[PDB]
Amino acid sequence: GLIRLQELIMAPSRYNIRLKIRQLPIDSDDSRPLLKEMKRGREFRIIFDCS
Amino acid sequence: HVIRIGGIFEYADGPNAQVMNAEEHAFRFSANIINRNRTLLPNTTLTYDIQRIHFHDSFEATKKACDQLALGVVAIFGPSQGSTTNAVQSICNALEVPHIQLRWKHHPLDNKDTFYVNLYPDYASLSHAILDLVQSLKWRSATVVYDDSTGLIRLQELIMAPSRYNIRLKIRQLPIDSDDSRPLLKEMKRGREFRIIFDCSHTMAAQILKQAMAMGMMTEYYHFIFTTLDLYALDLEPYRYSGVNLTGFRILNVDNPHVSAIVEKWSMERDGVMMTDAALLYDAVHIVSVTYQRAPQMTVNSLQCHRHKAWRFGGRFMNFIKEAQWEGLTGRIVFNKTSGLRTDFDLDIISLKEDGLEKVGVWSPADGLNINRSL
Amino acid sequence: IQRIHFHDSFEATKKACDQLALGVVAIFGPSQGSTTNAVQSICNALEVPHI
Amino acid sequence: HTMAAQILKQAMAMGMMTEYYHFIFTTLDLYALDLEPYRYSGVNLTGFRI
DSSP, X not given: OTTTSHXXXXXXXXXXXXXXXXXXXXXXXXXXXXXXXXHHHTOOOOOOOOO | OEEEOBOEEEESSGGXXXXXXXXXXXXXXXXXXXXXXXTSOSSOEEEOOOEEEESSOHHHHHHHHHHHHHHOOSOBBOOSSHHHHHHHHHHHHHTXXXXXXXXXXXXXXXXXXXXXXXXXXXXXXHHHHHHHHHHHHTOSBOEEEESSTHHHHXXXXXXXXXXXXOOBOOEEEOOTXXXXXXXXXXXXXXXXXXXXXXXXXXXHHHHHHHXXXXXXXXXXXXXXEEOOSGGGGSOOTTTTTSOOEEEEEEOSOTTOHHHHHHHHHHTTOOOOOOOHHHHHHHXXXXXXXXXXXXXXXXXXXXXXTTTTOOOTTHHHHHHHHHTOOEEOSSSEEEEETXXXXXXXXXXXXXXXXXXXXXXXEOOOSSSOOOOOOOO | OXXXXXXXXXXXXXXXXXXXXXXXSSOOOOSOHHHHHHHHHHHHHTTOOOO | OHHHHHXXXXXXXXXXXXXXXXXXXXXXXXXXXXXXXXXXTOOEEEOOOO
16 A cells, blocks of 8 residues: 555645554454554544555 | 585576676685585585576576476575566475575465565564664654665554654655755755665665765764665765764674674675675575585475476475574574564664774664662 | 466466467456566567556 | 865865855865865855956
8 A cells, every 4th residue: 555655655745734654454354453543543534445 | 416506697688698796606606615615515515506587577587497497406596576586486385395585575474375485684673673773762753765665665664653652754755767866855954854764775875975975964963874784885984074973784793703704705706895695695505505404315306397296395395494593694593483484683783983883782673772977 | 268366476377378379369367466477577578468 | 275175175074064164265276176066065155256
């Protein structure tokens, strides 16, 4: 995904935007620890590309 | 009793190219001086083979490997391109052959393959050593500057590191379109930048030296981070007297007098410092040498590509390989046996004086840095 | 049409040499890019395009 | 001019080619060896012309 969107990673040259970065651990699919981490972030404007 | 390995190198005009690299130089050099080292193998003779191919082709080295197995070679080291080492690893694992590797390539756990190792350092351990560095710098603002698109994957650990250790960050690429990033450097001086990390080629590192020298961006207000070990080609007497805080890395035991003497004899033989890639070559030769020495007698055979002939003790000698314990030029060499791949390795931390460059710290994946009376 | 497994360059390399010995004009490769790098190599080597 | 080139070499070598440094250059043969490496440092600077 990095090489899929590194310009979108390097986007904030043209705009005042900050961002978190979250790889899904592909080891399994129970993201509920990572979901509670997102809950600690409690964020609302997030990009998603996966299967 | 004679044994023979092979080797495949990419060049400009392939077999019709002319100049040997220093890797072929060190290849013949190391192999012939360890044949001279009569500590190695009294009755057994180690010979070798060198193939020249072009850059960026799998099929060239495919034919070369089919030639080497039509001969039947006792060991095989790996090529440069990922597209090569794809098919190399495929036919190696398919035909009970080990694939010795040197560079980083992408490695899927989904591609459950076995018969290979790599001499390349695990980037997660590298990035975590850098994390140890910058938390020792106690920084809360930084900027990512990088040469090629590959280092983003190779540094995505450090990219995630602002999560558990909050730090401001800007992310920009060194443009490969020309030999110039000076207007970006003008942006960086306007970017108010003092905390910048650098991974690139030694050639691009020399471009950095030249430009940041010429930009007026050699300031003592700068404390900058450098990944590759290849400062030894590069002069620093135009640089080390400007007061710029700076940090290089090392994995090699230069501080071994023995290894330094190996470099000393190497220095007469084409600044005049033995390549890290040549050190990797020497270590790969010596680990395969030790794993061959540990084993009893086996069946050196010739097998064919279009058929399905696989050499029976290939798994046995793979068990010899992946479970080896060797103290190399870089020092301790040990694998993640879940992967069979070297992920454990120490990092010498070095930095500069007006005197010159000097070792300032160590690193490990386990731990890391270590520097009667009356009232 | 050749049914192959995942994640093997040499498998589709053999089958690519098979469809070359056949002689094919539209080249409909695998999912694994690391597999089909050699396919593109032999396509560009033997004067034939690649899809 | 030779020792002036020595000045440029040493303040180059010491990294004292700074924008916080403002230069009073006097003799007429300033141009002699190349000044363009010293150009893009970004200093304040002054010369003379006759």
